[PDB]
Amino acid sequence: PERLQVYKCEVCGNIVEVLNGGIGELVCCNQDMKLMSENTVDAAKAKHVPVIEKIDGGYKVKVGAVAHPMEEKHYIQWIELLADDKCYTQFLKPGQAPEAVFLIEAAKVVAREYCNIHGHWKAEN
């Protein structure tokens, strides 16, 4: 595994983020955890691809161009802002608007989001 990759156990629901890579394969509930590669699920990009907006002191991230649902059974679980050496994670809950604000000093950033139903997506500024 590699740093910052996201893996999920399709059985119990465990989802983890790699902090240190290693050489072992991640396993859970008798099967290899699935690498959740960004922008791979056959879903609408309009509501899943993060939209990044530069603001004073940081960035505002919206999911997505069109507001994604935030219902109990279908919502954005978290939005992250990545830099060359930072990963800021903002968890969300149903009922909230699919957006997050990150105060950070980085010219180049990558925003990611995870939809409980449609998976992992990313975009860069």
Place this chain on the structure above:
Amino acid sequence: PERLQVYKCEVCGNIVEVLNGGIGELVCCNQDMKLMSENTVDAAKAKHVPVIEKIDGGYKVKVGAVAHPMEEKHYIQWIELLADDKCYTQFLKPGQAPEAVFLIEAAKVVAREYCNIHGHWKAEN
């Protein structure tokens, strides 16, 4: 596993952080992954317990009361700041200072740091 918990795979090196909890046991290289519980390792607190300093617009975290080594074989791999529903992670490498700055609007925070040799540690304000 519960959100924010850090697990390590003995022998193979992988270290992951839980983004979504579940009942399944994380496995890697033929053993259950080891929960890296904070402040349980028999090591000097002076160099491992994070020190939190409130600054303008955020917090400055130093590891620790006494500067921790940042050598190729013994260093702080990352520092995190936890608040409400946020987990901000700053990755570090040998040769850098055992310090991290986080711009966040939260009165109550928890700082964490992971030493490649002495494990997981935390502190709160």
